[PDB]
Every structure is written in structure tokens, then in C-alpha cells.
Coordinates of C-alpha atoms in Angstrom, one line a residue:
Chain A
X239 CA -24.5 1.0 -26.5
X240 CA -25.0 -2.8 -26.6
X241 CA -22.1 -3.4 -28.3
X242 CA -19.6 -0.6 -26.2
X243 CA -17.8 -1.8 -22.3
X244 CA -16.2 1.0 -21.2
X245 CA -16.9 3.4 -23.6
X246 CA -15.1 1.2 -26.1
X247 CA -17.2 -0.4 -28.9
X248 CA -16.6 -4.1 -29.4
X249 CA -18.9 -4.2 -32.3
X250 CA -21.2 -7.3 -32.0
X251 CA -23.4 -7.3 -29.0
X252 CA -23.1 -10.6 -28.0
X253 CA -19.4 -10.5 -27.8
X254 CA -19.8 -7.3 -25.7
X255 CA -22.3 -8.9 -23.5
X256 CA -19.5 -12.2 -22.7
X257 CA -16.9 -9.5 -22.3
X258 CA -19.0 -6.9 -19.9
X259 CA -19.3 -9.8 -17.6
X260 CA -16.2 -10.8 -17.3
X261 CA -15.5 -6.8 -16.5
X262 CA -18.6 -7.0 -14.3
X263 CA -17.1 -10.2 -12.5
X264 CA -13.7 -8.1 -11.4
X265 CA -16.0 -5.2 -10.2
X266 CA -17.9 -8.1 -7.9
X267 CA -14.7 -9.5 -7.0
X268 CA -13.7 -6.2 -6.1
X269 CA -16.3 -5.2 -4.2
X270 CA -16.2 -8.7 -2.3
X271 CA -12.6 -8.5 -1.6
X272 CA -12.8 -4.9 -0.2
X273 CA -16.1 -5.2 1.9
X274 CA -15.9 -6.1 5.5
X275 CA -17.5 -5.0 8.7
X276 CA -16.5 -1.4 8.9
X277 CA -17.5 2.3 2.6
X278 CA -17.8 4.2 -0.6
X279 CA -14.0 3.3 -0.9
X280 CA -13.8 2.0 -4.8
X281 CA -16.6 5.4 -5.4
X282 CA -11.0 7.4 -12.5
X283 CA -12.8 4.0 -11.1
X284 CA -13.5 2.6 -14.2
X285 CA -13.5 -0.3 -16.5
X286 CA -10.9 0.6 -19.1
X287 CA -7.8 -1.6 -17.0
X288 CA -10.6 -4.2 -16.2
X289 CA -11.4 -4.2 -19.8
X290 CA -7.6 -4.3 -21.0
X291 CA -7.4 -7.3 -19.0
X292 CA -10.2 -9.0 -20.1
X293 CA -9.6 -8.4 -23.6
X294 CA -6.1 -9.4 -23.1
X295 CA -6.7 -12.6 -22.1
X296 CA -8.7 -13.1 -25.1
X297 CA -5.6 -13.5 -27.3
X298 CA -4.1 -16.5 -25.9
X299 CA -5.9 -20.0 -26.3
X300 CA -7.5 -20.8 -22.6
X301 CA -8.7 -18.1 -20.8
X302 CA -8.4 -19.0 -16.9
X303 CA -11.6 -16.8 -16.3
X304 CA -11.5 -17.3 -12.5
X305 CA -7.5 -16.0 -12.7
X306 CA -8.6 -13.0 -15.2
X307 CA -11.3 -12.0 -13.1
X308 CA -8.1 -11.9 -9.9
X309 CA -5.6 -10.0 -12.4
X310 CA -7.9 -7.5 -13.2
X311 CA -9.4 -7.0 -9.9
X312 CA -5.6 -6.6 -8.9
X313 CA -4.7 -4.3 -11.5
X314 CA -7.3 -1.7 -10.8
X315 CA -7.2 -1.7 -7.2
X316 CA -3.8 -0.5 -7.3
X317 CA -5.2 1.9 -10.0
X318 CA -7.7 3.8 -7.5
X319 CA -4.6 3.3 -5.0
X320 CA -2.7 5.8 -6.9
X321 CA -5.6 7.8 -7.7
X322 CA -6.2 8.3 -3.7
X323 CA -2.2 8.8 -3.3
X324 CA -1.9 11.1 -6.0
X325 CA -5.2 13.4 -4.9
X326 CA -2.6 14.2 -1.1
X327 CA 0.1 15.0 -3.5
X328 CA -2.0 16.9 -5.8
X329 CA -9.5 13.8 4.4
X330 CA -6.0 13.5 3.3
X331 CA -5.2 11.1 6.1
X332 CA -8.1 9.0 5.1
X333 CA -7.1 9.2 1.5
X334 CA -4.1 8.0 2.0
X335 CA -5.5 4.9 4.4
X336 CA -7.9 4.1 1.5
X337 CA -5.3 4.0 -0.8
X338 CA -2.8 1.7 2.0
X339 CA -6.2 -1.0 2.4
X340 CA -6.8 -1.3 -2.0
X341 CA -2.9 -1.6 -2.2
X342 CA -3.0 -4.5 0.7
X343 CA -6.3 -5.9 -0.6
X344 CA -4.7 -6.1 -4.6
X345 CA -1.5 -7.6 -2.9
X346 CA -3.6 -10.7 -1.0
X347 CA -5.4 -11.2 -4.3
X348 CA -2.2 -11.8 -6.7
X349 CA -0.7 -13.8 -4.0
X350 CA -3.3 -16.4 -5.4
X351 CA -1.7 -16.0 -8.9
X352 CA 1.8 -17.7 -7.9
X353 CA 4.8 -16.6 -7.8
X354 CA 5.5 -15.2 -11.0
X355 CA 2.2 -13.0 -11.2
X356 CA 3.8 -11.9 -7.8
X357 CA 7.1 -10.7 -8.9
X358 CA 5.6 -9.0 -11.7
X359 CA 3.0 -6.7 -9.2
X360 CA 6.4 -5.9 -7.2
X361 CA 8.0 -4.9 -9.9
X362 CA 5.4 -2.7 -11.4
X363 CA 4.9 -1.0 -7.7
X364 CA 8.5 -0.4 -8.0
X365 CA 8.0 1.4 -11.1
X366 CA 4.9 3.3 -9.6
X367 CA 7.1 5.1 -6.9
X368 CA 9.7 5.6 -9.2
X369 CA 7.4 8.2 -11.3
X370 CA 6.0 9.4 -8.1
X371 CA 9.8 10.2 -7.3
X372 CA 10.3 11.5 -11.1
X373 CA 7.4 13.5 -11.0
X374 CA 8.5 15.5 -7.5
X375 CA 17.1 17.1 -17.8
X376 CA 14.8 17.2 -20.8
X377 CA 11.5 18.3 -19.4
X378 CA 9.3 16.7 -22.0
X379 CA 11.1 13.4 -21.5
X380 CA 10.7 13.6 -18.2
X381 CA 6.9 14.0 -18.6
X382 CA 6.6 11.1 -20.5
X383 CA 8.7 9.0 -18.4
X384 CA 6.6 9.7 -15.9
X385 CA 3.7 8.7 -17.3
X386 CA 4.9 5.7 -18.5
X387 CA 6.4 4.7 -15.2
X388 CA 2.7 5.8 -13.1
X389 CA 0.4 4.8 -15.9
X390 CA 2.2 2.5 -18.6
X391 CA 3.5 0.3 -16.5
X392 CA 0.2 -1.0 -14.8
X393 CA -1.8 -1.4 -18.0
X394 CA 1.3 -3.0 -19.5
X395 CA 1.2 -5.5 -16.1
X396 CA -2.4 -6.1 -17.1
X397 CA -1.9 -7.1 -20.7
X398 CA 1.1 -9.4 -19.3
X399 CA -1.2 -10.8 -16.8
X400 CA -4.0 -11.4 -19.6
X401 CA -1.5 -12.9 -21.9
X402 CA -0.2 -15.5 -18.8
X403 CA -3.6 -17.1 -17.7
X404 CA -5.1 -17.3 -21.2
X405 CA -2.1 -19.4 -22.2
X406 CA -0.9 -17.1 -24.7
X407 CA 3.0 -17.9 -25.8
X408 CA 5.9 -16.0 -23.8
X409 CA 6.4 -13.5 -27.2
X410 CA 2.6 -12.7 -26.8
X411 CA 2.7 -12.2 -23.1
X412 CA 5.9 -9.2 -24.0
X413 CA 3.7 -7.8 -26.7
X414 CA 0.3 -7.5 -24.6
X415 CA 2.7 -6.0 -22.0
X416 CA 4.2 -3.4 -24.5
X417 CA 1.0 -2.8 -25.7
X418 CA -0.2 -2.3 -22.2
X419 CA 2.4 0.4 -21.7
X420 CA 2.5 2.3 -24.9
X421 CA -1.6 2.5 -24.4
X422 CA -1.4 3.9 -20.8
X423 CA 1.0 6.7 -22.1
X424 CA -1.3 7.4 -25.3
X425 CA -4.5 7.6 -22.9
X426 CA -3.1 10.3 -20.9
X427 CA -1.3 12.4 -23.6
X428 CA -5.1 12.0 -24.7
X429 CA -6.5 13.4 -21.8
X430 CA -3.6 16.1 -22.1
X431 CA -5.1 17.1 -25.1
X432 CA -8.9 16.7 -24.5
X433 CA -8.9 19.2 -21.2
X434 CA -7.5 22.1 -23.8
X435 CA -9.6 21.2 -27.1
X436 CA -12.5 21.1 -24.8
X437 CA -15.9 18.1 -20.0
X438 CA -15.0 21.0 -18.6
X439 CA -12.1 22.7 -19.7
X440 CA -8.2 23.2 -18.5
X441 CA -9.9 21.7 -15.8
X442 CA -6.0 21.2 -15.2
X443 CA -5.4 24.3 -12.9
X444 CA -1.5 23.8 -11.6
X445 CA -0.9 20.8 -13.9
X446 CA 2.1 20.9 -16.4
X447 CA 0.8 18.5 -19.3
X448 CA 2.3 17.4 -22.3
X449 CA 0.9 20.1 -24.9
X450 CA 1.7 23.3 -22.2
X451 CA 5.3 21.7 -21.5
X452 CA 5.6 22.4 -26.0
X453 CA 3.9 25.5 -25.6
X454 CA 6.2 27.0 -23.0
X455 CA 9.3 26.3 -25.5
X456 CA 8.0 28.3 -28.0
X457 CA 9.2 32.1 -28.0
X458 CA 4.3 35.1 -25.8
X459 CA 4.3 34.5 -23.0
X460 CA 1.7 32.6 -20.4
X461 CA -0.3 33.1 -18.0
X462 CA 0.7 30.2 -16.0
X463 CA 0.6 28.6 -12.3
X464 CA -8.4 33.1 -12.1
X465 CA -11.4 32.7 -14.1
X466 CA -10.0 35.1 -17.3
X467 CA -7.0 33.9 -16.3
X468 CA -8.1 30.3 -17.3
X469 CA -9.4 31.1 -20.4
X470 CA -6.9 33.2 -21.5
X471 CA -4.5 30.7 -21.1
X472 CA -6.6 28.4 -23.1
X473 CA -7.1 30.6 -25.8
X474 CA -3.1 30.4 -26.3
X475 CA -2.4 26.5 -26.3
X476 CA -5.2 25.7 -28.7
X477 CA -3.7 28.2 -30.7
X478 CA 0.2 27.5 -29.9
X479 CA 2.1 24.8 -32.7
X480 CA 2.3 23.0 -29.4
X481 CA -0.7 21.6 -29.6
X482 CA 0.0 20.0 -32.7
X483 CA 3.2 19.1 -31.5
X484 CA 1.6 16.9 -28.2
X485 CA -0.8 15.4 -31.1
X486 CA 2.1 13.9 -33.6
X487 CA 3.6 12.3 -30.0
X488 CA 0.3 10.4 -29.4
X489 CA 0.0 9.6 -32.9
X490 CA 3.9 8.0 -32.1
X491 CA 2.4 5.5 -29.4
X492 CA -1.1 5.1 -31.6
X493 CA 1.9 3.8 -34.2
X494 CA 3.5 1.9 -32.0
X495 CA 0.7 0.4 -30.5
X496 CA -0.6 -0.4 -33.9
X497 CA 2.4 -2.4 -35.0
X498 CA 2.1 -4.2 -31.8
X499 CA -1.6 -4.8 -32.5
X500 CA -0.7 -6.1 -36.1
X501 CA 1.8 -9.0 -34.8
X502 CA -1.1 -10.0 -32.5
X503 CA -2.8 -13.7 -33.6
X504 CA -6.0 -13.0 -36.0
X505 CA -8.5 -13.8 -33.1
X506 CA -11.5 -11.4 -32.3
X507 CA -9.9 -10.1 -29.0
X508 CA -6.7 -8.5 -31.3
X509 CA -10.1 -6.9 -33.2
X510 CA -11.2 -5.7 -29.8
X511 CA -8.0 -4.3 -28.2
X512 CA -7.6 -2.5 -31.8
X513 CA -11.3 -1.0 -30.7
X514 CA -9.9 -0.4 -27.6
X515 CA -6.6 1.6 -29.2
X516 CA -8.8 3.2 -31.3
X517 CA -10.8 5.2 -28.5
X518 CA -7.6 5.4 -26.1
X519 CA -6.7 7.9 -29.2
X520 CA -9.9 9.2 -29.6
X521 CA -11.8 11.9 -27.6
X522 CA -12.5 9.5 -24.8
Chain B
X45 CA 25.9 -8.6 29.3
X46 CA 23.4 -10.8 28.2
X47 CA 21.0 -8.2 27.2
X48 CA 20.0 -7.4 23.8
X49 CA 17.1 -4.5 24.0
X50 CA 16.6 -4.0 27.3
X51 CA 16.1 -7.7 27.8
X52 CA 18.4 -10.2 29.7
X53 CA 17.3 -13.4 27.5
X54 CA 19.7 -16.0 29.1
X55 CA 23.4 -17.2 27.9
X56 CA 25.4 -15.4 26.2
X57 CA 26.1 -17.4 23.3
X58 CA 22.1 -17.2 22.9
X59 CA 21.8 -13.3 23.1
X60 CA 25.0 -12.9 20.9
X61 CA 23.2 -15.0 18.0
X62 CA 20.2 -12.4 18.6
X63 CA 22.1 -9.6 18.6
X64 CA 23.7 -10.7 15.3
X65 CA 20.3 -11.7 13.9
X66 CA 19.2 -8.5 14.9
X67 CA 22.3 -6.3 13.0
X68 CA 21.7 -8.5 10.3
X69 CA 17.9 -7.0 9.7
X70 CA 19.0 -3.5 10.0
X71 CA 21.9 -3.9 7.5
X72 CA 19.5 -5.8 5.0
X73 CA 17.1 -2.9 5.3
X74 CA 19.8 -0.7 4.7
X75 CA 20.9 -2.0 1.7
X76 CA 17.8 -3.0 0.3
X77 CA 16.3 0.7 0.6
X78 CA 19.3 3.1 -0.5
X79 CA 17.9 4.3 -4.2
X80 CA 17.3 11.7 0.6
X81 CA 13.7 10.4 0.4
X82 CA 13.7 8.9 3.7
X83 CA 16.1 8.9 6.1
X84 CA 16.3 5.9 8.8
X85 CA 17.7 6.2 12.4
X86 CA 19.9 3.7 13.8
X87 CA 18.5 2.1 16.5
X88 CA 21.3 -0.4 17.0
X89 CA 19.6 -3.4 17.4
X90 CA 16.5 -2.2 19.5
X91 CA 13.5 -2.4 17.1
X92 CA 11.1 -4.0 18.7
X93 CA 10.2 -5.7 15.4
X94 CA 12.9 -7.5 14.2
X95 CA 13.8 -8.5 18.1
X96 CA 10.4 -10.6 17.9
X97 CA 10.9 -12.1 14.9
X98 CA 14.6 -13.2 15.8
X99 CA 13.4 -14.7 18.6
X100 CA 10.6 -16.1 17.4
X101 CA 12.7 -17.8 14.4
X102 CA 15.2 -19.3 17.3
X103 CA 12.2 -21.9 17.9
X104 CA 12.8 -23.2 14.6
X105 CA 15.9 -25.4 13.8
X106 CA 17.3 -22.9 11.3
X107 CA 17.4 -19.6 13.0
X108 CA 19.7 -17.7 11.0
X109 CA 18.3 -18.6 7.5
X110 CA 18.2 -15.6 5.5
X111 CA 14.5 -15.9 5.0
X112 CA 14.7 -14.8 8.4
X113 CA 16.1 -11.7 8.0
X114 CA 14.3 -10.6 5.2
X115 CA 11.2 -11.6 6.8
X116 CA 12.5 -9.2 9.7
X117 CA 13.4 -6.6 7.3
X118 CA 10.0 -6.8 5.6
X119 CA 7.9 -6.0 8.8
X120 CA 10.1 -3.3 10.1
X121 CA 9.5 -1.7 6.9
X122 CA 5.9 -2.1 7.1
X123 CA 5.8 -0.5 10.3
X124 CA 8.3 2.3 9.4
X125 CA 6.2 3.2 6.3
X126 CA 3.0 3.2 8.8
X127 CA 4.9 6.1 10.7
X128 CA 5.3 7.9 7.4
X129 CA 2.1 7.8 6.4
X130 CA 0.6 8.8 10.0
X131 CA 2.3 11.8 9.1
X132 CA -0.1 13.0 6.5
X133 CA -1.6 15.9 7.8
X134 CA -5.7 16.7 7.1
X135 CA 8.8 16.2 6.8
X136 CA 9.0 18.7 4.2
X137 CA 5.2 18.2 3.8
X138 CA 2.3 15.8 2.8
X139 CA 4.2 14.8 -0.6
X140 CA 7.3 13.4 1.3
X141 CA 5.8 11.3 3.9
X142 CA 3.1 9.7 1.4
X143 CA 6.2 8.9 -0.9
X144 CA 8.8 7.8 1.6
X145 CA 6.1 5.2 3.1
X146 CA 5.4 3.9 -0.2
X147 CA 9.0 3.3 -0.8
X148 CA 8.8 1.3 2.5
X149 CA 5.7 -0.4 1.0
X150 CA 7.5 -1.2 -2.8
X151 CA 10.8 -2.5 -0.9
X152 CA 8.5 -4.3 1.4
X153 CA 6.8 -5.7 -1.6
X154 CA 10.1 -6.8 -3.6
X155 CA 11.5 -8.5 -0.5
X156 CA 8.2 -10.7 0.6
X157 CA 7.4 -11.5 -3.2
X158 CA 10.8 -13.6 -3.1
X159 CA 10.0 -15.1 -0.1
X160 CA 6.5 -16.7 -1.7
X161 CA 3.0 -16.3 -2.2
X162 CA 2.0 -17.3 1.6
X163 CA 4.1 -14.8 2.8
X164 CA 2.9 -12.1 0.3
X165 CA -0.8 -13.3 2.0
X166 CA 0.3 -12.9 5.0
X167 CA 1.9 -9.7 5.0
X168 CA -0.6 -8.4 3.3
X169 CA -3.6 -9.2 5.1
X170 CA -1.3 -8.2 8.1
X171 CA -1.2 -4.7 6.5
X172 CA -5.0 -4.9 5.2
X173 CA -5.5 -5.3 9.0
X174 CA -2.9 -2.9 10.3
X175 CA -4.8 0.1 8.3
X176 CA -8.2 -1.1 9.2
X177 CA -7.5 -0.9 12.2
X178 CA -6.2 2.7 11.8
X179 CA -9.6 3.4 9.9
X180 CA -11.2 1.7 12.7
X181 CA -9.7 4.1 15.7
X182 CA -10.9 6.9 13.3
X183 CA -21.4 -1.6 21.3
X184 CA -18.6 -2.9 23.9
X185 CA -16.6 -0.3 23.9
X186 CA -13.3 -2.5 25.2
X187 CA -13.8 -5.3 22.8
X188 CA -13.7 -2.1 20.4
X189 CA -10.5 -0.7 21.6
X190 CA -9.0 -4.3 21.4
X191 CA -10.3 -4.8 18.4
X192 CA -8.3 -1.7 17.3
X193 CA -5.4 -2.5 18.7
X194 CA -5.1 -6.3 17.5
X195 CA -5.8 -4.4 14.3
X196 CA -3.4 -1.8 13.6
X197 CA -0.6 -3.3 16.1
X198 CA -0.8 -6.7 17.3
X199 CA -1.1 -7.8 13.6
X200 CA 2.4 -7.0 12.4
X201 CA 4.0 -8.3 15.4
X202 CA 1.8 -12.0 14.8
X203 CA 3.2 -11.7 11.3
X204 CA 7.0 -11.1 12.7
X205 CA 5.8 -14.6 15.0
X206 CA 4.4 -16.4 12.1
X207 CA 7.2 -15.7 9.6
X208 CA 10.0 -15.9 12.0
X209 CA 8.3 -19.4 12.7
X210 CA 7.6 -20.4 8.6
X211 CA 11.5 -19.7 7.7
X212 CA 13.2 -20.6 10.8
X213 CA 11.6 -24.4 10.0
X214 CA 9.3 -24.5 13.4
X215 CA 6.6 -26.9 12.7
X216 CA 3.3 -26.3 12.0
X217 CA 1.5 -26.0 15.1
X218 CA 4.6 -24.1 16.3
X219 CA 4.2 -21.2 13.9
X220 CA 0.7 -20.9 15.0
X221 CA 1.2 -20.7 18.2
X222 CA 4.1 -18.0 17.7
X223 CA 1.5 -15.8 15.7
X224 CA -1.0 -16.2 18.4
X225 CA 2.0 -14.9 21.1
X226 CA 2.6 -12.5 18.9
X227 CA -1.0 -10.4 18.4
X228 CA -1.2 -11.1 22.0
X229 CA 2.4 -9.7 22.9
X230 CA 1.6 -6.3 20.4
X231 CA -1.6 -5.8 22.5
X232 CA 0.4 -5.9 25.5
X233 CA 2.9 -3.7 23.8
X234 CA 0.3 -1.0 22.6
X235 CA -2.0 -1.6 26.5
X236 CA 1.1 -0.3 28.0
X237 CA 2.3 2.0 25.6
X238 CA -1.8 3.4 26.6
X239 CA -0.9 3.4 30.4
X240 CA 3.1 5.3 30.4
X241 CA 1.0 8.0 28.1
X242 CA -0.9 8.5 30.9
X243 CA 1.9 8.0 33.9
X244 CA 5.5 9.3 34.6
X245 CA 3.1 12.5 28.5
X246 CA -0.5 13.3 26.9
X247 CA -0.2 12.7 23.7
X248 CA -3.4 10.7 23.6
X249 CA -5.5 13.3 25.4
X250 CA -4.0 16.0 22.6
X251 CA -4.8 13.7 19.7
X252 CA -8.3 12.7 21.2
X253 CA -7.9 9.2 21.1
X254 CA -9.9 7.3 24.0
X255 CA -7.5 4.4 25.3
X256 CA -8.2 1.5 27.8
X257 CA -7.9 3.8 31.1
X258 CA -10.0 6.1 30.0
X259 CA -12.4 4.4 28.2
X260 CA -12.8 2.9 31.8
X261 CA -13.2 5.7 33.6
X262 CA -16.3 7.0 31.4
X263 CA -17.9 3.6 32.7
X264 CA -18.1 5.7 35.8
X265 CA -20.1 8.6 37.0
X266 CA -19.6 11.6 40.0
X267 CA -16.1 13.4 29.3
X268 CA -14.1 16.6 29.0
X269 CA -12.3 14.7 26.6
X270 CA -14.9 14.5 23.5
X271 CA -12.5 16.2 21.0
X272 CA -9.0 16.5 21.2
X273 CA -6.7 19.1 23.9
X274 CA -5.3 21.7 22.7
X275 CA -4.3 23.7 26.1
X276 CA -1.1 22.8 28.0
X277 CA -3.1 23.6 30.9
X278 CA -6.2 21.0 30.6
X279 CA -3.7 18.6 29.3
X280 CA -2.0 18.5 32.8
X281 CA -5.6 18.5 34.5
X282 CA -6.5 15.3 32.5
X283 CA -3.3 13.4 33.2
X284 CA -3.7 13.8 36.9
X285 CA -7.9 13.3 36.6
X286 CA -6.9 9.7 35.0
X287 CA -4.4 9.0 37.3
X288 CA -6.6 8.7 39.9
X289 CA -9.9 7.2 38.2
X290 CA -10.1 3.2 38.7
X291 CA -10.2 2.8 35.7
X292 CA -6.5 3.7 35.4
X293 CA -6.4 0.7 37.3
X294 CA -8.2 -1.8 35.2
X295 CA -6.3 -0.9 32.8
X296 CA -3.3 -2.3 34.6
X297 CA -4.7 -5.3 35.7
X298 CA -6.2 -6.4 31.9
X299 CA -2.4 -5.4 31.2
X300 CA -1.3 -7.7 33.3
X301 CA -4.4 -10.2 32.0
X302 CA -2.4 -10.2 28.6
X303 CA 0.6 -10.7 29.7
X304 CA -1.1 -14.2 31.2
X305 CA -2.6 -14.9 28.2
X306 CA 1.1 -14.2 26.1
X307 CA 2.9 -16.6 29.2
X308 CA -0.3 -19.2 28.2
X309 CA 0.9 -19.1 25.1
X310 CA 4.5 -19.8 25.2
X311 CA 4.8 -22.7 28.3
X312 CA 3.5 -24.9 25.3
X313 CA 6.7 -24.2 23.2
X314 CA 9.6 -26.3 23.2
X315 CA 11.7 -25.6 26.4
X316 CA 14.5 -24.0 24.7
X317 CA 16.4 -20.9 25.3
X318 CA 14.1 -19.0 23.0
X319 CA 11.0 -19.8 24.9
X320 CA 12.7 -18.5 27.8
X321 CA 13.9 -15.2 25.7
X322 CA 10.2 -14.8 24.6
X323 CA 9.0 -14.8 28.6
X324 CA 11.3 -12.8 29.3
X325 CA 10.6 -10.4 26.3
X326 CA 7.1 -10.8 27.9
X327 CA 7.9 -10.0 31.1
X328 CA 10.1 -6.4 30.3
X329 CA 6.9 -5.6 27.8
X330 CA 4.3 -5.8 30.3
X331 CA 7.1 -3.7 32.9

């Protein structure tokens, strides 16, 4: 445990200790930022985009700490933003309010970041509603344009935004951000895959994920759209070849994020984000 | 003639440069939001929004810059993607109005990004403020109305001031003061938006929401509205109950205390034909 932020394992606890704090200093800028005189608003909410960030900003050659600490305070306040906004969409008007005041409040705090760290938040909102849109021919392509446009694209923005203020060179900064996005698309096909291998279990009731959407190809047929029901339905995709289909596409990202990883400078964050790769690909 | 919403704001060749600062807001946003998701109705130049900001950006020497306009374009958005999301019930459902208003909110965010960090601040604390004070709604029980209502209305229509100000040129103390007319202006607006719900309908007394005349009146004594009115029949009985409390008429009269405050605030502009626009704007709000 000394050594693991986030439930990824940096493997030497003093680095782990530098790094938690610098996750711990977004969660305080966070909570500083969001506070005022009105409030279990940030209470998945977690450290992995704070983490990404941190470690991201450990490739390039001068960290900015103060300006990490902003991008990754940033990043996942529009995180539980979509979180809110996506539990509506499946108090609603309060969710939705919540969601308004972290996407204001992660707005503000970039505006310190200049113009360019600007720009590239608009841009990623841009691709936020465009997956919302998406997600309301190909149906698996579809899926995973989706994801990458809701869930790629901000963890991508997060490796751009640690490549930037530590320095790093403009090719760095494109790889940290392609890493960024192939990683957000590997975590969820992940969590695709967890909920069926078995905490709980197709805990997924209504949602089409990447190893049913191979399943339902196949030709036998579901049980598909209450407690039997559930588990009868599981019993099929752990068995179905597309299970094993959803697994080779993660193991395509975990490629692909691998080769990024491997053009990366031999510095211990590129050891780190491999860490991190390692358990987005893992059982979480 | 030489009215432009509603609003006789001079000469001629001053409300036909509004007007066409105006049209050119709504054709920006028009543009800058076609992709079914939403669908936007043509007001034809009587948003109450852009009119502000117009006017507020003929103080400065450059008027029609096209900062202007997208700074226009940027708050109407704002506020159209706050009636989308008021819409979220606890169009075609839930789905639709969360999505349309964040469409609003990434156009919004695309436009003000060009114009610069300050005015990404800016319009985003104005938005951080505009939904607390929607939480808020949801001690001195006027300050805490007013409170609400420089919240989640007089804060957009300061912003529409400031930036107007900021990209018209208008000096410094200039686009200060225009922010200040402005939150004091959108009280106004909402203060008598509060009273015509209550004279001639009900809206307030069906959603449960206590505004200035009533909060008044329960300073009296001789509270059927707790919840929120669902009868037809009590909602008439209320309506006519608060017609004739006094408090219906303090209401009017700390209407009429903002509108002082807003005329306070622009005599120490530049006499121009905006600042006479802006009284006048004043004058029509509180009327």
C-alpha cells in the first residue's frame, strides 16, 4: 500500500509518497475551489485523472507543480460533471446543477492556465457533447467512439496538460495526449469486462457494453433489456466468443498505449504511467 | 421608429446601430450552434441579453467590434442553456434538455475561450454564480431573496455590462461601473418579473417559490403557501390574497429603490446617447 496512489503501484514508497501529494494537492484545491457559503458535491470521484496528470507532468523536465495541481483539479471536475450529467440520462434537477457549478468552477480554474490550456478544455467539452449526442452504422464502432469521445478525450486533455507545464517537448505533449486517450478507452472496455467476469456483478442492468454488443452478433438468443434474469444473462456472455472478442480489442489499446509508452523519455514517470497502463488493463 | 425592444433609446441613427448590433448576435449564434437538438426561436432582436450588452458596448469607442458580438452571443447562450436545463424534471424528456443546454454550454465555451482568459473568468464565475444561485432558491429573509436573485439573474446581465464594456474599449472604471448597472438592472428585471406574476399569472405560487411580495406579507400577521399549488382554485385565491397585502406594495417601492440605485449608477457615465439608451432601458424595465 505504501507504494500504490490510486490503486496503481508506483513501486518505491518514497516516489509514491512525492506523487500522492501532488494528487492530494488537486483534491485540496478542489475542495477549496468548490467550497463556499452554501455540500457533499465532489462525494467515480477518484484519483486515477488526478494521477494521470501528475504522472504526466513527470515526463517533461520542470514540473510547474502549482499549474499541475490547476490541470488536474480541472480535469476531474469536469470528470464528476459528466458523472452527475450522465446519472439524469441514465434529485435530477439538483444533479444536473451540481454538475452546471464543477463544470463552471473547472472553467474559472483553467482560465489561470492561458490561453492555450483554454482552447484545449473547449475543445475537449466539445468532444464531451459530441459522444453524449453519439451515444443518444457499425454498432461496435459506435461504442467505441463514444467512449473515446466521453472518456478518451479528457484523460488524453490531462496527459496534454501534464506534458505542457512540465516543459515536456511539443511531440511529447501529442504522445501524453494519445496516451491519455487510448488509456480512457482501455479503462472502460476494462470495466466492460470486469462487471461480467465478476464487485457486484452485471451490475450493468440496461447498459449495452462492449462484450454484449459481440455477443448479440453471434447466432441463442438473450435475455436482454429480473434477478434469474440477470444471471442468466451472465451465464451466456462469460461463455459467448464475445467475451474474448471485447478482450483482444483492449489488448489493441494496451498495444497501442504500450508503443506510445515505449517512445516516452527513460525518466521514472514513463516507469509510472507504464504502472499506471498496466492496472488500467488489469482487474481494476 | 426609434425603438428597438420596446424601448425608444433616442436618434435614429443610434437605435439603427443597435438594432444591427442586435441582428448581428442572433445570426452569430445561429451560425455558431447549427451542428434537431435544440431548436431556437427568433425573437427578432428582443433578447433582453444581447440588447444590454449592445448598449452597454456603445459606451466604449468601438461598439461594433466583433468581440462584441460574440461576447453577446456567449451570454445569450448561457442563459438559453439555463432554460434547458430548468427543464430537468425530478422536450422529448430529461435526456434532451440536459444535452441541448450543454451544447449551449460547449458553444458558449468555444466562443469565450477565443475571446481570452479574463473573459473565460468571467463568464464562468458568472455561471458558477448563476447556478448557485439556483441551488440557493432551492436569517434576513430579503437580503436572502436578493441574494438569490443577484445570483442566478443579475449575474449574467453584469457580465453582458462588463464584457460589452471590456471589448467595446470603455475604460477601466467604465466597465466597472457597467457591471455594477448591470447586476443592479437584472434585479430590477427579475423584482418585476416577481410583481406582473403576481398582477394583471401564478406561476410562482404553483412552483412554491416565495418572492419579494410575499416574502413581505409573511412579515405580517391577522402561510398557505409552504409547498407548492396545485389547485386552479387556491391559485386564484392567492393571487388576489397578495394583491392586497402591503407587502405587495413594498415590493413595488424596493422596485422602484433599484431602479434609483441602476439611474445612480449610469449619471456617472459619459453623457452619450448610450447612457441615455441605458436610462431609458431602465426606465421601460422597472415599467
Amino acid at each position: 500500500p505504501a507504494t500504490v496512489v490510486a490503486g496503481v503501484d508506483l513501486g518505491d514508497a518514497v516516489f509514491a509518497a512525492a506523487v500522492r501529494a501532488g494528487v492530494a494537492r488537486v483534491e485540496q484545491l478542489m475542495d477549496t475551489e468548490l467550497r463556499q457559503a452554501d455540500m457533499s458535491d465532489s462525494l467515480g470521484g477518484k484519483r486515477f485523472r488526478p494521477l494521470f496528470t501528475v504522472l504526466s507532468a513527470q515526463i517533461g523536465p520542470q514540473p510547474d507543480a502549482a499549474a499541475v495541481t490547476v490541470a488536474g483539479a480541472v480535469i476531474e471536475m469536469i470528470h464528476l460533471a459528466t458523472l452527475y450529467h450522465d446519472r439524469v440520462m441514465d434529485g435530477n434537477n439538483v444533479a444536473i446543477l451540481a454538475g452546471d457549478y464543477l463544470l463552471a468552477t473547472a472553467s474559472r480554474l483553467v482560465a489561470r492556465l492561458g490561453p492555450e490550456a483554454v482552447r484545449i478544455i473547449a475543445d475537449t467539452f466539445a468532444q464531451l457533447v459530441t459522444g453524449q449526442m453519439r451515444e443518444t452504422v457499425d454498432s461496435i464502432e459506435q461504442y467505441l467512439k463514444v467512449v473515446q469521445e466521453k472518456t478518451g478525450s479528457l484523460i488524453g486533455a490531462a496527459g496534454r496538460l501534464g506534458g505542457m507545464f512540465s516543459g515536456a517537448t511539443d511531440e511529447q505533449v501529442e504522445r501524453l495526449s494519445r496516451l491519455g486517450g487510448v488509456v480512457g478507452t482501455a479503462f472502460q472496455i476494462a470495466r466492460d469486462i470486469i462487471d461480467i467476469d465478476s464487485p457486484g456483478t452485471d451490475v450493468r442492468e440496461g447498459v449495452h457494453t462492449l462484450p454484449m454488443l459481440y455477443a448479440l452478433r453471434e447466432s441463442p438468443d438473450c435475455a436482454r433489456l429480473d434477478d434469474a434474469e440477470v444471471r442468466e444473462a451472465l451465464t451466456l456472455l462469460r461463455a459467448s466468443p464475445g467475451m474474448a472478442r471485447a478482450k483482444d480489442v483492449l489488448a489493441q489499446y494496451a498495444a497501442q498505449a504500450r508503443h506510445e509508452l515505449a517512445l516516452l523519455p527513460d525518466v521514472p514517470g514513463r516507469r509510472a504511467l507504464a504502472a499506471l497502463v498496466d492496472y488500467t488493463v488489469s482487474r481494476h
